[PDB]
């Protein structure tokens, strides 16, 4: 399948080269997979989700995304226009309040929630969790992410936006999950992207168009935007049977575009998420 005039990041994920504008992908499109977006919520009524999104948990007075961040990330995973995996099932877990913040205790509870809740959902092609969030190093947060991964969920987490080594941030620094840095449309490391040995992969993160609340769209930047590209890619590849939740991060790194990025510090992987789709 071909989506013309796609957001640059979608085109990038299906290309060996920067500078193209069509997203190419197998029409299976993540059908039969599930992606949990652990964030500020998801505006499930957005036409872009086509009934494939739903809120399943909140820790606040409402399950509504009153921020937009979670809706944007969910859109990059799985919206019809802005998403990588256009037929996946999206589940929202609102661990972040409408100011975009959450206590680590709440974030941990949300991760453990997903590890259990997947057993309540129909995800025959597998389960992914996208965590466009984080703060300073916490062994408890990292352990929660490790448990979620161990439970059979492909966990993708943001590296962070500190232009610093991700070793000092969580859940970015948990080795066993898929830690995602950000790039721009010219294949530069995004200016704010964290780096370091713990990064597994980069995805598009600067100037990413996706869904927003009030049935709208906008372009924003962050490792929060890169992460759902990788989560959606994992779901897509799992539907194709190319990999599993346990192995998808490694598979994505194995099959990435290698050496394309600039300003990658010595010791950080130079790997850009790529679907290797050949029509």
């Amino acid at each position: 399948a071909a989506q013309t005039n796609a957001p640059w990041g979608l085109a990038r994920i299906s290309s060996t080269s920067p500078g193209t504008s069509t997203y190419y992908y197998d029409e299976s499109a993540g059908q039969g997979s599930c992606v949990y977006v652990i964030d500020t919520g998801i505006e499930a009524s957005h036409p872009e989700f086509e009934g494939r999104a739903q809120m399943v948990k909140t820790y606040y007075y409402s399950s509504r995304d009153g921020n937009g961040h979670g809706t944007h990330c969910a859109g990059t995973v799985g919206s019809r226009t802005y998403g990588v995996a256009k037929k996946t099932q999206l589940f929202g877990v609102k661990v972040l309040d409408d100011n975009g913040s959450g206590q680590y205790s709440t974030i941990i509870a949300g991760m453990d929630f997903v590890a259990s809740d997947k057993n309540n959902r129909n995800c025959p092609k597998g389960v992914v969790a996208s965590l466009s969030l984080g703060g300073g190093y916490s062994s408890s947060v990292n352990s929660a992410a490790a448990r979620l991964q161990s439970s059979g969920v492909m966990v993708a987490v943001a590296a962070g936006n500190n232009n610093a080594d991700a070793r000092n941030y969580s859940p970015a620094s948990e080795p066993s999950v898929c830690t995602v840095g950000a790039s721009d449309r010219y294949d530069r490391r995004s200016s704010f992207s964290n780096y370091g040995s713990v990064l597994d992969i980069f995805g598009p993160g600067t100037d990413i168009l996706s869904t927003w609340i009030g049935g709208s769209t906008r372009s924003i930047s962050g490792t929060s935007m890169a992460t759902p590209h990788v989560a959606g890619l994992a779901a897509y590849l799992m539907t194709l049977g190319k990999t599993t939740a346990a192995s998808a991060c490694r598979y994505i790194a194995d099959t990435a575009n290698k050496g394309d990025l600039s300003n990658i510090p010595f010791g950080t992987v130079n790997l850009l998420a790529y679907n290797n789709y050949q029509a």
Binding site: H69, S101, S132, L133, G135, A158, S221, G222, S224
Partner: peptide, 7 residues
């Protein structure tokens, strides 16, 4: 404490 903002 938190994610990477409202964005």
């Amino acid at each position: 404490p938190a994610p990477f903002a409202a964005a």
